[PDB]
Amino acid sequence: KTHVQLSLPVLQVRDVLVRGFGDSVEEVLSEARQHLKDGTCGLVEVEKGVLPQLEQPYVFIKRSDAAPHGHVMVELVAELEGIQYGRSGETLGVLVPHVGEIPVAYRKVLLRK
Numbered sequence: 001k002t003h004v005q006l007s008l009p010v011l012q013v014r015d016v017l018v019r020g021f022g023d024s025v026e027e028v029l030s031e032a033r034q035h036l037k038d039g040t041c042g043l044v045e046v047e048k049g050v051l052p053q054l055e056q057p058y059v060f061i062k063r064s065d066a067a068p069h070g071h072v073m074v075e076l077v078a079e080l081e082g083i084q085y086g087r088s089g090e091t092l093g094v095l096v097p098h099v100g101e102i103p104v105a106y107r108k109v110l111l112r113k
Helices: 025-038
Strands: 003-010 041-044 056-062 072-080 082-084 093-097 103-111
Touching: 003 025, 025 041, 025 056, 025 072, 025 093, 082 093, 093 103
Parallel strands: 003 041, 072 103
Antiparallel strands: 003 103, 041 093, 056 072, 056 093, 072 082
């Protein structure tokens, strides 16, 4: 399938144990895609002071359309030193490895894979 329905656990930034996917734009996008597929991907909602607590390069999920079965359609955009790789709509948050942190909520997304 071109799109996969996912429910992403929403993590508080201060709980997050692994704060990024790796060391290059290409690696973080690769790792983010693999974790999304394996159900080992969390979502941190972006607010004042959140991003400087995470590791660059960042992976964002961004709204790709204006929501089948409640799932917002999203795509991945990476950022490193203020340059983004990809072009999409509004940020739903920043992706991180999920390694068993207790979520505060779930974000239903339809991921273009």
